[PDB]
Scaffold this motif. Structure first.
Motif, short mmCIF file in Angstrom:
data_model
loop_
_atom_site.label_atom_id
_atom_site.label_comp_id
_atom_site.label_asym_id
_atom_site.label_seq_id
_atom_site.Cartn_x
_atom_site.Cartn_y
_atom_site.Cartn_z
N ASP A 1 0.88 -1.16 -0.15
CA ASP A 1 -0.08 -0.05 0.10
C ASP A 1 0.98 1.21 0.07
OD1 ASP A 1 -2.93 0.84 0.15
OD2 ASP A 1 -1.91 2.12 1.56
N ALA A 2 1.94 1.55 0.73
CA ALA A 2 2.91 2.39 0.94
C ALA A 2 3.57 2.63 -0.51
CB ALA A 2 3.98 2.10 1.93
N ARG A 3 3.78 1.49 -1.45
CA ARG A 3 4.45 1.64 -2.55
C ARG A 3 3.56 2.01 -4.05
NH1 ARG A 3 9.76 2.09 -0.98
NH2 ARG A 3 10.48 0.36 -0.24
N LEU A 4 2.36 2.12 -3.64
CA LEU A 4 1.67 2.53 -4.96
C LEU A 4 1.58 3.84 -5.38
CD1 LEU A 4 -1.91 1.11 -3.38
CD2 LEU A 4 -0.36 -0.22 -5.04
N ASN A 5 1.80 3.92 -6.78
CA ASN A 5 1.71 5.31 -7.35
C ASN A 5 0.47 6.15 -7.25
OD1 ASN A 5 0.23 4.53 -9.67
ND2 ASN A 5 2.02 3.46 -10.64
N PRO A 6 0.34 7.34 -7.42
CA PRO A 6 -0.81 8.07 -7.23
C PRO A 6 -2.18 7.50 -8.07
CG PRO A 6 0.77 9.54 -7.60
CD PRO A 6 1.61 8.17 -7.55
N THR A 7 -1.83 6.94 -9.34
CA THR A 7 -2.92 6.54 -10.22
C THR A 7 -3.34 5.11 -9.60
OG1 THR A 7 -1.81 7.57 -11.80
CG2 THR A 7 -3.53 5.76 -12.40
N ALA A 8 -2.51 4.06 -9.26
CA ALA A 8 -3.01 2.87 -8.49
C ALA A 8 -3.70 3.20 -7.56
CB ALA A 8 -1.69 1.97 -8.62
N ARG A 9 -3.36 4.00 -6.71
CA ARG A 9 -3.66 4.30 -5.46
C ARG A 9 -5.21 4.64 -5.42
NH1 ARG A 9 -1.10 4.75 -0.47
NH2 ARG A 9 0.90 4.69 -1.53
N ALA A 10 -5.38 5.81 -6.24
CA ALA A 10 -6.87 6.25 -6.70
C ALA A 10 -7.67 5.12 -6.86
CB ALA A 10 -6.89 7.19 -7.58
N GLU A 11 -7.33 4.25 -7.91
CA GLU A 11 -7.95 3.09 -8.39
C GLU A 11 -8.40 2.18 -7.14
OE1 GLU A 11 -9.92 3.14 -10.68
OE2 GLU A 11 -10.70 1.06 -10.53
N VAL A 12 -7.27 1.81 -6.52
CA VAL A 12 -7.57 0.81 -5.39
C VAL A 12 -8.43 1.46 -4.51
CG1 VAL A 12 -6.33 -0.05 -3.23
CG2 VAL A 12 -5.29 -0.49 -5.52
#
Ligand SMILES: Nc1nc2c(ncn2[C@@H]2O[C@H](COP(=O)(O)O)[C@@H](O)[C@H]2O)c(=O)[nH]1
Ligand SMILES: [Zn+2]
Ligand SMILES: [Zn+2]
Ligand SMILES: [Zn+2]
Length: 245
Positions: free
Chosen positions: A14-25
């Protein structure tokens, strides 16, 4: 892994997600109130235990038995109808990346992907058919009975006596492992299962004695802990490739 190992994999990722992946997750998690990447990480094991339909069908998705073939995976041999962790992780990664599907369908695939990247990094999840990934290899660990599978799932991790808040910064303190430069969702699952199998086949992982304790823990807990960190980093790289553009 046991529930804690799963959550630690998701917390590292979770700490390593890029902004785009973080938003979708976070969009997918929002369909299920109070769900986090950590809280969904054990879900597939509860599904297996409680759902006599998909839980029973999905039981084979947690592992693959390749140690009798010297850790060389061949789909028709270990996985005929796709009911193993290599084929299931591939399929669920494709489903997760399918923007034509509903948030609810994609969340379900996220729950499987988070769990199975965890499990595919547990050495005993890619071990021998003969003793069912070490379940039938019983042993004494301290003054307590267990089996080689349980010992790698949770037995060694439990010796730290840490909750996630104590265990996570310990994993994060490790030297960064060497990842592949890129995620390939269709090919990495086989690579990961084979690497995990090679650890199940390493000198001493199967002990030469029936009683084991601190010496085994001292040697192999750091390997279990390195595999949690590696699983977390691999899971972030996969979610970044699948959901991050
Ligand atoms: N590698 C491997 N793991 C197995 C096998 N059978 C069950 N497992 C794993 O061993 C653990 C306990 O199995 P269960 O008792 O739930 O069937 C689970 O994490 C499950 O995935 C097997 O044939 N091979
Ligand atoms: Zn597990
Ligand atoms: Zn297990
Ligand atoms: Zn599992």
């Amino acid at each position: 892994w046991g529930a804690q190992g799963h959550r630690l994999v998701a917390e590292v990722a979770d700490a390593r997600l890029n902004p785009t992946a973080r938003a979708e997750v976070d969009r997918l998690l929002a369909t299920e109130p109070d769900a986090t990447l950590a809280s969904i990480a054990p879900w597939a094991d509860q599904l297996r235990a409680k759902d006599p339909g998909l839980g029973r069908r999905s039981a084979g998705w947690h592992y693959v038995n390749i140690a009798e073939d010297n850790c060389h995976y061949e789909a028709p041999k270990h996985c005929r109808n796709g009911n193993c962790i290599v084929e299931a992780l591939k399929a669920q990664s494709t489903i997760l990346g399918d923007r034509s599907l509903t948030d609810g369908e994609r969340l379900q695939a996220l729950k499987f992907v988070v769990h199975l990247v965890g499990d595919i990094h547990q050495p005993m999840h890619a071990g021998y058919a003969h003793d069912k990934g070490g379940n039938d290899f019983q042993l004494q660990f301290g003054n307590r009975g267990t089996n080689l599978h349980s010992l790698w799932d949770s037995g060694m991790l439990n010796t730290r006596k840490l909750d996630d808040a104590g265990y996570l910064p310990l994993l994060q303190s490790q030297r960064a492992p060497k990842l592949a430069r890129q995620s390939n969702p269709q090919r990495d699952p086989q690579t990961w299962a084979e690497a995990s199998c090679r650890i199940s086949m390493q000198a001493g992982v199967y002990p030469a004695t029936r009683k084991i304790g601190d010496e085994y823990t001292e040697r192999y807990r750091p390997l279990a802990e390195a595999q949690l960190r590696l699983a977390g980093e691999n899971l972030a790289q996969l979610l970044n490739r699948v959901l991050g553009a």
